[PDB]
Design a binder for these strands. Structure first.
Ligand code: MG
Length: 1002
RNA sequence: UGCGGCCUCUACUCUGCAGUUGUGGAAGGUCCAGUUUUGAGGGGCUAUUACAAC
RNA sequence: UGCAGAGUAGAGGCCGCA
């Protein structure tokens, strides 16, 4: 078999990127080894899989972890492993599949790495009909070809390509006989490669595709651009972009190294502006492919970026804005600062929660001595000596369940509140002063913008102090219908139990009703499950029915729960014994069950459950009170609330739940005073409405234009009632005005929809009752309607959130850079903005910490839209070693980007210099030709040795050549002192020049 | 070779759920509707945030 | 990470028709 001509003609590029490919693979395998505490197919992680399929599994938990992460870091492995299963019958992918795919991929990658990085070696593996070809290479070519079929299908989903745009590939890959691979196709992944046996091998394009599975997207683009693989399509063609996208769609995801940026007022401003240019995710799903495409932008460094919001970062951004701005004197937000682990066999975790400004808390979290706060306990990064320790995590705000928790300090400039640790075991936390809904944060921001943060803060603190005064009075039993108004809290902001208590209507929930209802519901479900079966459930239910004693200390604990859920005469005994050991105050029915298999056990469990619940129902029907179940009459839920007891729980035990519409009255009073707001009826004006009116009437602004684009919703499809030829519902894209009108007419339109839809269901014989169909449609319309309504409500919220970020960011930058804003407007903001604030040029400075060092990257002038460049540079593996060479931790952004592009151009030229050196050595010394012919491994290292001994090179020169060559293979810079260098951006160029000169002979 | 129906398998996207006990439904989630394109309001349901103890 | 539903795309088997 001959090496493909593409490979032979582009050897320097295949050489470079094959090396990069194999290093990237090792990196992933190494990472998995570390995290899971245990010739790349002999790697510990790969050995594990090899043995996992064959022998009895000693840790299935580890096997399954390895298989899950391998598929995370190598996304193509999902497709190839699924094809390997089918190839082989079991339903699911097994360690053998994963092992076989990767053994072959690695084997062929290694082969081509060796051929392309060596002037001459005699490769036995290329001999026609050999073991390597028959067992590894030829199977892989077929696998790769089948992989690509699916990759092209994924292109439709990922980038919204249509059949017409992919047909230039999809229609021409295979040729029909009676089916066959069209080896004449320009992008054919298989060829005969002059094999006399006439078996399909990987083609050159095939080898390029294999390599690109193991590259980053940036390097896929650099690599493929140097190959003539695009027939006649030109640099700017859509076809070229399709080809390149197809070669990256499922490529390696590398584990990313830790970065910690220093934040500032300016940085937070810029984080907010770069957030508002992105599409909200709830909006993006509703948009046509055309308009979704408008968020796919090309960066400065010619990289495609999807400008879409991962998540709603409005609230954290606002908290950073307040902290770094030092805008609240007394309020501090709830931060987590890691976890305490102690050994006490299980390990127990406790979160290290506290309150302070994110910066100040972070300064306290990690001492110079590497201990936490004032604790003494080591921050790490079955041995009792290793415990206790604290998991290393950067201070972040706690934001769960749509809440923001706070602590109110009496005095200004208070220190961070970190938890005390006791007995190296207990983390003594603080109940937050109060808790606010994340939905309240827009109005707070608006209040802050209109009045100032200090006035905003005074209002939060005053509201908090009113609730406290109320709860104190409850504890003295001094709250009446007569005096409730004096506490200054509106009825709609008081708990219902207080309102019940003052009205003389205090009651618990009715236990008897609840038990009667629960028993009936559960009996019905039991029969549903019995029927479904004849036609973690069990672990949850077994514990549900386990009686509690001694504050619940008797019930099944975490580890034993996991074992129970996961869990021949002896085998039967063993299974029964488990429930004896778990002491199942007994489970009410389980003992009746006691068999041969899980399936028998589930059936018997359900029958016995049915008999138990029937008994209970029958006793309820006799009017009897029963008590056996998991409902517990002594819980306060079921008792009447008392003023004094509830007063104490509200004051001492819980945070104050702050009300919604805290800031409304003050916002409205302000706006009423402005003459621009003269028209507005403030009796029908919510804060979402008023934000929009403010920016249109006071600021001559409007929301981003992408909130006006047409949107798709299934429910609106159903209401529009338009069908294709075959009779499927059409996907409409409506305007808001259209949907307003459909919604008004939803009753009529739903009637029509159901009539037609029912008729279409009846066509199928499998489904044949009438009421069966009515239920199917009921659920169809409810679910769809609910999805639509929620989506539209949330998008409206994103609009005003963006208004607020824009306003705050603009305020920061106006005062800071001394730039000329005032003219800038949210309506101008767009993902690729060519005008307005995002296009303004400003000096910038980005400071970050990586691998225990602290660096700064500057710009004397930079468009605000490009602020994301800094993270791309900081993330780069080379940044560390490069700045070691520069001899400064402070550097220009432009210089580093130029350096990195020049490095990228030098790397293949290094490969070429090596090649020509090896060639010289082979031409001079004929001993090596013999060593090749008798199949002996010659390396660069070997050639250097011959050059050294026969006095062509000296040790110094040998060491330099070796070290530079190694640095480039690593995709990194060499250590300081190896070679004399120039300044940025010519460091890589100067290293290349040295290598070139040290590779000339004596 | 084209078209229609039925069955099986695979992929992608979107929505819902996950130690024990206690406390808490002014908040959050969800459901209903002659409600909202103004996270506003009404009615039902529900321990989700947190903290203590194991 | 395990489980359920809906929409979309693709492949295989069977039948009828041109
Ligand atoms: Mg309200």
């Amino acid at each position: 078999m001959n090496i493909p001509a593409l490979v032979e003609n582009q050897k320097k590029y295949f050489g470079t990127y094959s090396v990069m490919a194999m290093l990237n693979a090792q990196t992933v395998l190494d990472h998995i080894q570390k995290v899971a505490d245990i010739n790349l197919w002999f790697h510990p992680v790969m050995s594990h899989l090899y043995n996992a399929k064959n022998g009895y599994d000693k840790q299935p938990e580890k096997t399954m972890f390895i298989i899950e992460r391998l598929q995370s870091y190598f996304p193509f492995l999902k497709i190839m492993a699924e094809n390997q299963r089918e190839y082989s019958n079991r339903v699911e992918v097994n360690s053998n599949d994963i092992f076989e795919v990767l053994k072959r991929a690695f084997g062929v990658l290694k082969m081509y790495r060796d051929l392309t990085n060596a002037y001459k070696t005699y490769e036995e593996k290329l001999n026609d009909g050999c073991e390597f070809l028959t067992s590894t290479e030829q199977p892989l070519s077929g696998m790769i070809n089948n992989y690509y079929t699916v990759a092209l299908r994924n292109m439709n989903e990922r980038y919204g390509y249509k059949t017409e745009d992919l047909a230039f590939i999809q229609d021409k890959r295979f040729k029909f006989v009676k089916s066959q691979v069209n080896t004449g196709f320009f992008l054919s992944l298989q060829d005969y490669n002059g094999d006399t046996q006439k078996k399909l091998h990987l083609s050159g394009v095939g080898i390029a595709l294999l390599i690109c599975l193991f590259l980053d997207k940036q390097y896929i683009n650099i690599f493929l651009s140097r190959l003539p693989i695009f027939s006649s399509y030109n640099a700017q063609s859509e076809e070229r972009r399709i080809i390149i996208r197809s070669f990256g769609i499922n490529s390696i995801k590398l584990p990313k190294d830790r970065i910690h940026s220093e934040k500032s007022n300016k940085s937070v401003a810029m984080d907010m502006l770069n957030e508002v240019k992105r599409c909200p995710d709830e909006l993006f799903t509703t948009l046509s492919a055309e308009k979704q495409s408008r968020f796919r932008i090309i960066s400065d460094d010619h990289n495609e970026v999807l400008m879409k919001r991962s998540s709603d970062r409005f609230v954290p951004l606002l908290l950073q804005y307040i902290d770094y701005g030092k805008l609240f004197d007394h309020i501090r937000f709830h931060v987590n600062m890691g976890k305490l682990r102690y050994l006490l066999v299980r390990v127990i975790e406790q979160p290290l929660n506290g309150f302070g400004r994110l910066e100040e808390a972070e300064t306290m979290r990690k001492q110079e001595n590497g201990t936490f706060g004032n604790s003494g306990i080591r921050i790490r990064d079955a041995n009792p000596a290793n415990y206790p320790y604290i998991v290393d995590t950067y201070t972040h705000y706690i934001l769960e369940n749509n809440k923001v928790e706070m602590f109110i300090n009496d005095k200004e400039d208070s220190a961070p509140l970190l938890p005390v640790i006791e007995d190296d075991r207990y983390v003594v936390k603080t109940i937050p002063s109060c808790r606010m809904s994340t939905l309240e944060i827009p109005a707070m921001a608006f209040h802050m913008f209109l009045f100032g943060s200090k006035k905003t803060e005074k209002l939060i603190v005053d509201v908090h102090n009113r609730y406290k005064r109320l709860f104190q009075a409850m504890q003295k039993e001094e709250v009446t219908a007569e005096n409730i108004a004096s506490f200054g809290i509106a009825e709609s902001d008081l708990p219902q139990k207080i309102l019940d208590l003052i009205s003389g209507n205090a009651h618990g929930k009715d236990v008897d009703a609840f038990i009667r209802l629960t028993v009936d519901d559960m009996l019905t479900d039991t029969e549903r499950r019995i029927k479904r079966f004849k036609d973690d459930f069990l672990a949850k239910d077994i514990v549900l029915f386990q009686p509690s004693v001694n504050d619940g200390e008797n019930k099944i604990t975490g580890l034993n729960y996991r074992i129970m859920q996961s869990a021949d005469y002896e085998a039967k005994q063993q299974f029964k014994l488990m429930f004896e050991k778990a002491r199942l105050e007994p489970h009410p029915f389980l003992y009746k069950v006691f068999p041969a298999n899980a399936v028998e056990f589930y059936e018997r469990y359900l029958i016995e459950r049915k008999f138990y619940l029937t008994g209970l129902s029958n006793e309820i029907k006799k009017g009897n009170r029963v008590d056996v179940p998991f409902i517990r009459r002594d819980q306060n839920k079921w008792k009447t609330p008392a003023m004094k007891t509830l007063g104490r729980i509200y004051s001492e035990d819980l945070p104050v739940e702050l009300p919604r519409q805290m800031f409304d009255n003050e916002i409205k009073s302000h706006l009423k005073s402005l003459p621009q707001m003269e028209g507005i009826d403030f009796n029908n004006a919510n804060v979402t409405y008023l934000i929009a009116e403010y920016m249109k009437r006071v600021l001559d602004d409007d929301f981003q234009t992408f909130y006006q684009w047409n949107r798709n919703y299934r429910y609106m499809d159903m209401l529009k009632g338009e069908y294709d030829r075959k009779g499927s519902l059409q996907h409409c894209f409506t305007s808001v005005e259209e949907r307003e009108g459909l919604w008004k007419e939803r009753a009529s339109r739903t009637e029509r929809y159901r009539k037609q839809a029912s008729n279409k269901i009846r066509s199928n014989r499998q489904m044949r009752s009438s009421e069966e169909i009515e239920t199917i449609l009921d659920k169809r319309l409810s679910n769809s309607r609910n999805e639509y309504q929620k989506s539209e409500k949330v998008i409206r919220r994103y609009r005003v959130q963006d208004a607020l970020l824009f306003l705050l960011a603009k305020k920061t930058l106006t005062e800071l850079a001394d730039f000329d804003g005032e003219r800038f407007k949210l309506k101008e903001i767009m993902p690729d903005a060519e005008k307005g604030i995002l296009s303004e040029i400003m000096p910038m400075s980005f400071t970050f910490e990586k691998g225990g060092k602290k660096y700064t990257i500057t710009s004397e002038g930079m468009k605000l839209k490009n602020y994301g460049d800094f993270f791309v540079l900081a993330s780069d593996k080379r940044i560390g070693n490069l700045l070691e060479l520069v001899g400064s931790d402070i550097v220009s952004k432009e210089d580093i980007m130029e350096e990195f592009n020049k490095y990228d151009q030098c790397r293949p030229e290094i490969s070429s210099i090596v090649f020509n050196l090896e060639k010289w050595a082979f031409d001079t010394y004929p001993e090596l030709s013999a060593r090749v012919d008798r199949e002996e491994k010659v390396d660069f290292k070997s050639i250097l040795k011959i050059l050294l001994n026969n006095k062509n090179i000296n040790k110094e020169q040998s060491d330099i050549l070796r070290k530079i060559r190694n640095a480039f293979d690593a995709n990194n810079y060499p250590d300081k002192g190896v070679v004399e260098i120039k300044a940025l951006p010519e460091i890589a160029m100067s290293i290349k020049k040295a290598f070139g000169e040290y590779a000339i002979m004596k």
